[PDB]
Paper text:
DasR from the Gram-positive soil-dwelling bacterium Streptomyces coelicolor is one of the functionally best characterised members of the GntR/HutC family.
Both structures contain a homodimer in the asymmetric unit, and each effector-binding site is occupied by a phosphorylated sugar molecule. The sugar ring in each effector is recognised via direct and water-mediated hydrogen bonds involving residues Tyr98, Glu154, Glu193 and Tyr238 as well as via interactions with hydrophobic segments of Ser97, Arg221, Glu232 and Val234. Interestingly and different from NagR, one protein chain from each DasR-EBD dimer binds the phosphorylated ligand in an α-anomeric configuration, whereas the second chain preferentially binds the corresponding β-anomer. Although differences in the hydrogen-bonding network surrounding carbon C1 exist between the two anomers, these do not lead to differences in the overall conformation of the EBDs since the average pairwise r.m.s. deviation of the Cα-atoms of all four monomers in the two effector-bound complexes is as low as 0.61 Å. Binding of the small molecule effectors and the concomitant rapprochement of helices αE1 and αE5 considerably reduces the volume that is available for GlcN-6-P- and GlcNAc-6-P-binding to a mere 90 Å3 per pocket.
Author numbering:
A (entry chain A): 87 to 252
B (entry chain B): 88 to 251
The structure:
């Protein structure tokens, strides 16, 4: 009953199409925040710099799957907030509006528990182990584009990696 | 909180690459009979003999994970004393059997700590654990191991580099 998701630099939209599921989203919160030192470092901006934060509930065939909170430089992408009225895919929006294409990313996978609000939104018991992901992505020019923190349903996901030994 | 980068490396290698000292306790080792599932994973007959190895993994001194390894008993005579000799299963495989891992599929998912696991790992029953399952094949294309590891959710982080 779990989606088996390959670990690769792909969008949620791409990932769900690969599963033969229909991706939809509910915009939970969107707006600008000021970067602290941590976030400024992750986005290569000056501390105090403005960050577009996008929080979305991602669904598959209508069922909650994940809550994603992505962070981008507002200075680099000042029309991106409005462009998400037009695009359902952030990665598509980046490519079409700004000709930005992701090339490399570091992803982390951890497990812990949801907040009460997250559990409510995902329709899971608050004691259910969840998959807490982060993704730090850079584009073809080597600039960091996004820093994402996410909560994926522990009862709906496993991730799969291919390993190679030289 | 060990942030462990993912590639086909041994626990031993992973620990040394982080300055941490790799230490393990051998909990149990013995034969089991393969069901169809395990027989498929190890390319043996549905009633064949599997070596199951249970190990406690410690990062420095503190419990980190319980690792359950499955291999074909027929293919690896005297694996028990070989593991004792080399400590690293991957070192034993290479030095003793001339078996070298080439690729693996690793699954990452969540689970809850069982009473046995909570006891061994010094944690509480029913708290989140990261569960990794590794299916590895050697340079001849044969499966070598099927491994299931349960990590303390509060101490372990899986890291992957993604490329498009
Ligand atoms: N884990 C990634 C996120 O880091 C990324 O922000 C999202 C964009 O998805 P989309 O282009 O559908 O909006 O895709 C994946 O889910
Ligand atoms: N998850 C893997 C497992 O598949 C593998 O057998 C094990 C080998 O480690 P070692 O006994 O130190 O050679 O490394 C673990 O991290």
């Amino acid at each position: 009953m779990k989606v088996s998701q390959a670990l690769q630099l792909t969008s949620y939209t791409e990932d769900m199409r690969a599963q033969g599921l229909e991706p939809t989203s509910q915009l939970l919160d969107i707006g600008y925040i000021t970067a602290d030192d941590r976030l400024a470092g992750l986005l290569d901006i000056t501390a105090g710099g403005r960050v577009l934060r996008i929080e979305r509930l991602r669904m598959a065939n209508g069922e909650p799957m994940a809550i994603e909170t992505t962070h981008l430089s507002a200075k680099r992408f000042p029309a991106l907030r409005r462009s998400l009225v037009k695009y359902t895919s952030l990665y598509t929006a980046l490519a079409e509006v700004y000709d930005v294409h992701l090339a490399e990313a570091e992803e982390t996978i951890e497990t812990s528990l949801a907040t009460p609000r997250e559990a409510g939104l995902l329709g899971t018991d608050v004691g259910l182990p969840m998959l807490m992901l982060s993704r730090h992505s850079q584009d073809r020019t080597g600039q960091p584009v996004e820093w994402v923190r996410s909560v994926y349903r522990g009862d709906r996901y496993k991730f799969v990696a291919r390993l190679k030994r030289p």
